[PDB]
């Protein structure tokens, strides 16, 4: 969770890979923005 000032491209998204089709590691790539300036609030908890 990031209530922080940054610019979003015309099509933000995420890149996911499955670690040799194991479906266990389930990593992600943060291709959603390119800045984190004037970042105010943050929050972390169990994934929804």
């Amino acid at each position: 969770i990031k209530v922080c000032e940054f610019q979003f491209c015309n099509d933000p998204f995420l890149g996911v890979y499955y670690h040799k089709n194991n479906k266990s590691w389930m990593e992600s790539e943060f291709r959603v923005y390119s800045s984190a300036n004037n970042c105010t609030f943050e929050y972390v908890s169990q994934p929804f």
Partner: antibody
Framework: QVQLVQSGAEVKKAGSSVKVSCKAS????????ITWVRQAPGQGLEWMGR????????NYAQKFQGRVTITADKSTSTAYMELSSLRSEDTAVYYC??????????????????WGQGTTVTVSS | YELTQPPSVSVSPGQTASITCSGD??????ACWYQQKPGQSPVLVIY??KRPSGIPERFSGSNSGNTATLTISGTQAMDEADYYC?????????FGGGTKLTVL
């Protein structure tokens, strides 16, 4: 898109500090982990390490432990390293490549998408 | 972790060439094969035998339990290059000796 153009061949004396760098001039400096690999004649390819610009975490190779000081700054949009204690046998052609990702564990889900022309180095003694 | 391969391989043009990159527990390790031509920089051609677009459909293969194989189809004169098989093992990359393809 990225080109990873760099300087040409350089001539220097043996035992002196070696400085090389690769500059993109194309796509964003960040968002693409930069890797360097050494090409030598009849000796295969040698891997030294990698540095992620945005993350700032640099990984070293087993053989290059402590002989390289890799640094990268986003403001300058350039990646460079300092090399010393280099012998004539270590002379070879150095290459720089990207990975398209800036995550430590994601690098295995990618390859060397783009390479450099190769900057040969000659040692004079 | 350690890669050993034959120093060189020879095959007639237009034939199917099989290249073996033997190692120690390289199954489920994402082995990648690169191509370097004389006078040209290395390029990406494989990343499970998976070929990037814009590359002619000549490179293919399969990953067995403890061996990786590359199959070449429609070999031509311009295929003179050196193939290096590497993988991201223990957060590190290891480069093999490589094989030089010879065409009569």
């Amino acid at each position: 898109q990225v080109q990873l153009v760099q300087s040409g061949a350089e001539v220097k004396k043996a035992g002196s500090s070696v400085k090389v760098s690769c500059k993109a001039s194309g796509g964003t400096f960040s968002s693409h982990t930069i890797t360097w690999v050494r090409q030598a004649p009849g000796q295969g390819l040698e891997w030294m390490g990698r540095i992620i610009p945005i993350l700032g975490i640099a990984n070293y190779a087993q053989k290059f432990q402590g002989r390289v000081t890799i640094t990268a700054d986003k403001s300058t949009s350039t990646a460079y390293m300092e090399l010393s204690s280099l012998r004539s046998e270590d002379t070879a052609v150095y290459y720089c490549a990207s990975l398209q990702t800036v995550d430590t564990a994601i690098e295995k889900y990618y390859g060397m998408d783009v390479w450099g022309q190769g900057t040969t180095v000659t040692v004079s003694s | 972790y350690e890669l050993t391969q034959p120093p060189s391989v020879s095959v007639s043009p237009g034939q199917t060439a099989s290249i073996t990159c033997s190692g120690d527990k390289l199954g489920d390790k994402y082995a990648c094969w690169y191509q370097q031509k004389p006078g040209q920089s290395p390029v990406l051609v494989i990343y499970d035998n998976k070929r990037p677009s814009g590359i002619p459909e000549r490179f293919s293969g399969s990953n067995s339990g403890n061996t990786a194989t590359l199959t070449i189809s429609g070999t031509q004169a311009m295929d003179e290059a050196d193939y290096y098989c590497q993988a991201w093992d223990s957060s590190t990359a290891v480069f093999g000796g490589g094989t030089k393809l010879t065409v009569l």
